[PDB]
């Protein structure tokens, strides 16, 4: 039964043997394929990739980030995570035209999305509470209450908020479904950088998958991902060859390591990686 | 190397073989995969599925519909497409409590969401002029002057407005791409019909790709079909079964009759289909 990390692997065969040349707003430029999907097994295995170490700190403070509605980087970066800075910078925001805005001020970015969906935003010390449709607690209450529900999504895609975030979303939406108590997730990723994101982002919403799962006590099932625009930037190619050498080692296990009620009160101890022995990190350029 | 709709196909037997029993809301159940992905080619050919005739006209006069921006099932009536009266009855919407709304009133959906996206919706009659995100014409704008972006995306899943609608929408979003003047589209659809509305889902976006194609000045590229719960309704397994067995004819063309400018100016004459020499229908509830 072959390794969930061949998938990954063997999109970037695909993007580099037949990914067409196109250019970026950082004329870097790329070699991009549009529409692929990968399925992760979840069950017993936790798919944090081995062929290249993931920064799972990261992943997972950035996750409580998500969850706790913020949309400070200053708060994200606190927590030792630098990832979310860069936008959130006085530099950043005044090419943006938002020379009013307090440094690390992201917007209505994901946490205000997931939680306050068509509240009015303001700015990222406001009290938000009552404010829109909380969609992360809303999929909780429907995988409780109605399982076969077809409509368990969170969208993070908010058109009319567009132009005051800092970025747009990479993670428009994500999915999620049970069957015979296990439970997956989709996740509809309209932009992968194939080299530094997507090994990240599989792990985030493989954890969002494992939280929600423990939460309405369901075994996790699939994560599936679905790329939009998938692309691999030129000056990570070399990196990418080297990376496709290296065979994997059998994924690491995720443990829970309390029993918690609600998911607003997981905190980064709760967790432990377990049997995490990933090859040496290679680098890549990013802005 | 499977083509066309020999990868509907295969999505259907992928579901017989490996699909899972599944309750849903109306009791009768389903065999049910969650995450699938097919590409259908729209490079001189055009994806109306063969092995079943699918309603052409219904497509047609739906995606026109969803351009004006109509909520009005009555107006989709008139053209002789029924497929969303149902839902805008008197006894449908009551059940929904809004006793107040007129039948055929849906409420806020897809033409709604395309055009006027985060605009107050009050009712199908008013006037909703300038308000809201214009997603439709924005996807064209971004696609003729930045085709690069990965950012060109019409998302008809709105939260807020959910409570409102008669139906949630199957079709979440859609995301466009651009590469060697080509224009493709992905679909993410949380929730398809393998029997019944599939097939007419994919005829629906491809069209839509054809005439943001031509608007543009683009050739049509790829449509790509991602879904979500994808299920097949147990009273469809004997039909479906019948349908595999009959072997695909080429799909047809899709001729645009005349230069068209802006995309409201499309009519249902401007659009021919040449070629189509479906299998006869197989009958679903
Ligand atoms: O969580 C994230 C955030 C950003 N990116 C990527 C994709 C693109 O390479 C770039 C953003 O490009 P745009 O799609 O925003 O234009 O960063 C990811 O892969 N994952
Ligand atoms: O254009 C459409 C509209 C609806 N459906 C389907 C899928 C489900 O069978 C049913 C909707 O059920 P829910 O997913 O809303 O629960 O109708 C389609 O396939 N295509
Ligand atoms: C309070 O007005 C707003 C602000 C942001 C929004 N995003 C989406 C909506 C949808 N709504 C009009 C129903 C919205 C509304």
Redesign the interface.
Known sequence: PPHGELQYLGQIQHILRCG?R???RTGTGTL?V????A?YSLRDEFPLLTTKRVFWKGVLEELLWFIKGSTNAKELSSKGVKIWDANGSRDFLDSLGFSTREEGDLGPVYGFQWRH??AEYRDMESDYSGQ??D?LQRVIDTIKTNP????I?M?A????DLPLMAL?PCH??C?F?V??SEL?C?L?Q??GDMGLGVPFNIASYALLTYMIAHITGLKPG?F?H?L??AHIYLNHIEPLKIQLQREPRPFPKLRILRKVEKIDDFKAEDFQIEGYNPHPTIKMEMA
């Open positions: 067409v196109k250019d970026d991009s549009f529409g692929m999907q399925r969906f068509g829109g449709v969609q076969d529900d077809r409509r999504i969208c895609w908010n058109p009319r747009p428009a939406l999915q479904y069957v015979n997956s989709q509809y309209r932009s699939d599936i679905t939009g625009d």
